[PDB]
Amino acid sequence: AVKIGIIGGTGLDDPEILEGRTEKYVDTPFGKPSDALILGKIKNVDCVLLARHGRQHTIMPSKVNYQANIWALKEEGCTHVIVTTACGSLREEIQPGDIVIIDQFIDRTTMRPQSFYDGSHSCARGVCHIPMAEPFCPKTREVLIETAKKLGLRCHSKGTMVTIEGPRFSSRAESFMFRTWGADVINMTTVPEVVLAKEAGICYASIAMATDYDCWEEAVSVDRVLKTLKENANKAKSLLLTTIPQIGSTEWSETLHNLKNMAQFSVLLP
Template structure:
């Protein structure tokens, strides 16, 4: 089995907690699919944003029934790949590890630190039903620079408080960090913290897709003295009041992406994948 590299400039959208509203799409239809890795988190919602073909997928399922460790990240990415998505734009809630990143702020992250332990982090796992070979994908620049620039410029035009870079540390969850952990992560240079960026960004890179993330800070985790520690109620309250920010970026950025030339970028991503796979000896 081989990966398809027949891109139609369809935009895949993976919505995180409270950020997966299908109403952003026009002419919606649902499509249930299966993959060599099992079923995705939910049905694919196919539709358009200003005449740009889009595929929306709720990362945790539409009723938020899947905890971070149990998200079938490989199936999600494979399903979007099979729909010929050239781009994957994702939203994610996160905690802030920096004073200057305030709850409600957006961060267009550019780096990650992986603290997960239980997840499948490659499409090339040596199983007969999936791809052959071993993939040593470069990860110096995990997120697509060109797509990130579109998101950053869009946020500026919309007048949103948006940080143009940031390092996301992804923990296993589903628990939040201890205060000691939160302080250690700050000392490592992490700016924000969540439970889902890894392995999603890695798998998208292996699939040769342009991947970028809009992270929304909902709290200060638990490192900040005299500040209420993170809780589910606090996260959901902030998301409810600010989810329209991420939505507005998607609604403005996707038509822009659809009008741009991506041949060179996508060719580079494809070539990187092909040069990273060591095939078994015959």
């Protein structure tokens, strides 16, 4: 049995996506999640929705409690976590409105805890060095890619997301630099969300929505980002609604088992 956690990003966290909704505030050893968990279903699949920045978008990327958010979803029984994230495009072929099923990331954050194993919680003892060669769940990404195709949506099958600390946008020198490093899209929230999900043994995948071209001719601004999201939000919603039932009808025993082992054996006990 699967349970899909859904973390909604900027202008992409609509609760109306789930049926039979029930609000549930929880606490974790790492503090409170961004907002209440929204329990519900898409067809016959159990889901748990969570607004990354709070339902009123009051939490900046740097201060999102990534540990609490992932912990709460795991505790609720989530086997999978599919998220949405607005991002800047660093490639001409990735136009605003396009969806990018990212498969890699480049960390540029500097003040964020990236592990549950900080030796402050008995629930997570030891030193954990989680592998990051393949940060995102390939099976889920495959379904997302095929579903986007079935929906006729402009979608990119791979992409490297560079995550900056923020809250400021990048300078032009940084923008051009990230391009040389191989980054394809840019945001402020992928890391450490994807890292903690890995440590928790959860299949994590991300629906990245290009909302601008950053500044590498109209430079990025908050208004430009919100406008693009307003015009394209429906795509991510349709993708999630169509993808989730497919996930709930496939086999994951071996996939989840492997993630469990990788996470477990990454821990160095005293």
